[PDB]
Ligand binder design. Structure first.
Ligand code: ANP
Ligand code: MN
Length: 440
């Protein structure tokens, strides 16, 4: 549980109650009330805008400044408690914007493996180690967890079973014979597309979720009748469903940097124990409803090792001012996950601005944004999208993708640096084509 002693400077506490135990809805407001009593300048970090909106409900009445348009409230001026998304925190730290030296740093769903969340944990844990601050990381699955089957509010039926990853017609009757509501974790948007299409043809009502569609589509899980939610790993971060079954492929894609020169999406390959526990954790949450089902289609492995997100986190952290020339280290339990030289990605003022703009407005992956900024290219200079090797040709429906450049010339998309995440699904490619065309 929480104790006021956890609010003392130099304290970092991992509140690791099992999934559903009440960390976000019960323990968080307790902490916040105590922080306010103690006049502690406090930041609450929500993984997503959806979760931020839910927190406003659990925190209602309390004087919290919601630094998100996801929440519709008139703020007073009392507020010494701020709430923002993980990514917003890290983004503000990278920009010349002033962010308070928060006395207390509360990160909910602190297992989130997005680069900006990893970087935020590194920054926060370094501030605490410096003796400057306290921190509470709230997650059922702290870094390095080896338990894929933690406690739950009610008993879960765990079953190892072959899970389809492609359209099927026979041999998987248990999937469609089910009468309730299923959350199905897939390794990618495209894989989810195929499974969704198959289910829809079988007469099921399907909602699909991924990182860029999560806000709009998640509301459909409330506003619309559904049989299946097909989701990527984004739903591991405190997403609440009224479901009675989870189907878990136990698979994910792993961005991997090859030879420091390109990023591939490796796999699909096993999820971590933490990811598996969070996926399973979507059900068994109602103590009055035993027998929720968890079907899983493979084992776990430590696939965060060598995963690009921890290298990308270093790129972010190398560019956040801490004190003089010091550079914050990653949070200790996840600091092995990357082989990097601390400070090696530090950029000077102008290149850092370019780096930030390429990630924000550019919506480029961190790794790719870094290659461009560190090469001395300015944000609006898109010549690099076209002057790569033939091997870097991006394909769309089996034919090289083409755009009209801002000069009006039709050119094949051949980026100088290839990051597979810019074309891993239709939406990603659409966005990158707009970028290469100078439209953003
Ligand atoms: N909208 C809701 N209204 C009432 N009860 C709810 C609601 N949503 C969830 N609950 C219940 O409240 C409990 C506390 O939820 P929550 O505080 O999110 O747990 P948690 O420990 O943070 N879960 P996790 O992030 O998966 O480790 C859940 O286990 C549900 O049983
Ligand atoms: Mn939670």
């Amino acid at each position: 549980c929480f104790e006021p002693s956890m609010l003392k400077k130099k304290q970092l506490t991992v509140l690791d109650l099992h999934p559903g135990a009440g960390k976000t809805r019960r323990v968080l407001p307790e902490i916040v009330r105590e922080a306010i009593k103690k006049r502690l300048r406090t930041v609450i970090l929500a993984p997503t805008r959806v979760v931020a909106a839910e927190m406003e409900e659990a925190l209602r009445g309390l004087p919290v400044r919601y630094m998100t348009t996801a929440v519709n409230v008139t703020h007073s001026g009392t507020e010494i408690v701020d709430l923002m998304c993980h990514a917003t925190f890290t983004s503000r730290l990278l920009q010349p914007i002033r962010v308070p030296n928060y006395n207390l740093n509360i990160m909910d769903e602190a297992h989130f493996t997005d680069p900006s969340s990893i970087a935020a944990r590194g920054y926060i844990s370094t501030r605490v180690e410096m003796g400057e601050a306290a921190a509470i990381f709230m997650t059922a699955t702290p870094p390095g967890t080896r338990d894929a089957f933690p406690d739950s509010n009610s008993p879960i039926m765990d079953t190892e079973v072959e899970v389809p990853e492609r359209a099927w017609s026979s041999g998987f009757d248990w999937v469609t014979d089910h009468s309730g509501k299923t959350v199905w974790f897939v390794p990618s948007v495209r894989n989810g597309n195929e499974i969704a299409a198959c289910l829809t043809k079988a007469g099921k009502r399907v909602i699909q979720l991924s990182r860029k569609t999560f806000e709009t589509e998640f509301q459909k899980t409330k506003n619309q009748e559904w049989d299946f939610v097909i989701t990527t790993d984004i739903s591991e971060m405190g997403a609440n469903f009224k479901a009675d079954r989870v189907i878990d492929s136990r698979r994910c894609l792993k961005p991997v940097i090859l030879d420091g020169e390109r990023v591939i999406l490796a796999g699909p390959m096993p999820v971590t124990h933490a990811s598996a526990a969070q996926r399973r954790g979507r059900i068994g949450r109602n103590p009055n409803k035993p027998g929720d089902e968890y079907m899983y289609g493979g084992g776990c492995a430590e696939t965060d090792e060598g995963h690009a997100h921890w290298l990308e986190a270093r790129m972010l952290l190398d560019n956040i001012y801490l004190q003089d020339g010091l550079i914050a280290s990653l949070y200790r339990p996840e600091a092995d996950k990357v082989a990097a030289i601390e400070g090696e990605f530090k950029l000077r003022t102008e290149q850092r601005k370019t780096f930030v703009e390429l990630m924000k407005r550019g919506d480029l992956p961190v790794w790719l944004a870094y290659q461009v900024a560190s090469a001395g290219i300015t944000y609006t200079d898109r010549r690099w999208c076209f002057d790569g090797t033939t091997n870097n040709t991006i394909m769309e429906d089996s034919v090289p993708a083409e755009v009209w450049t801002k000069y009006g010339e039709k050119r094949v998309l051949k980026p100088r640096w290839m990051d597979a995440r810019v074309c891993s699904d239709h939406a990603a490619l659409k966005s990158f084509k707009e970028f290469a065309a100078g439209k953003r």
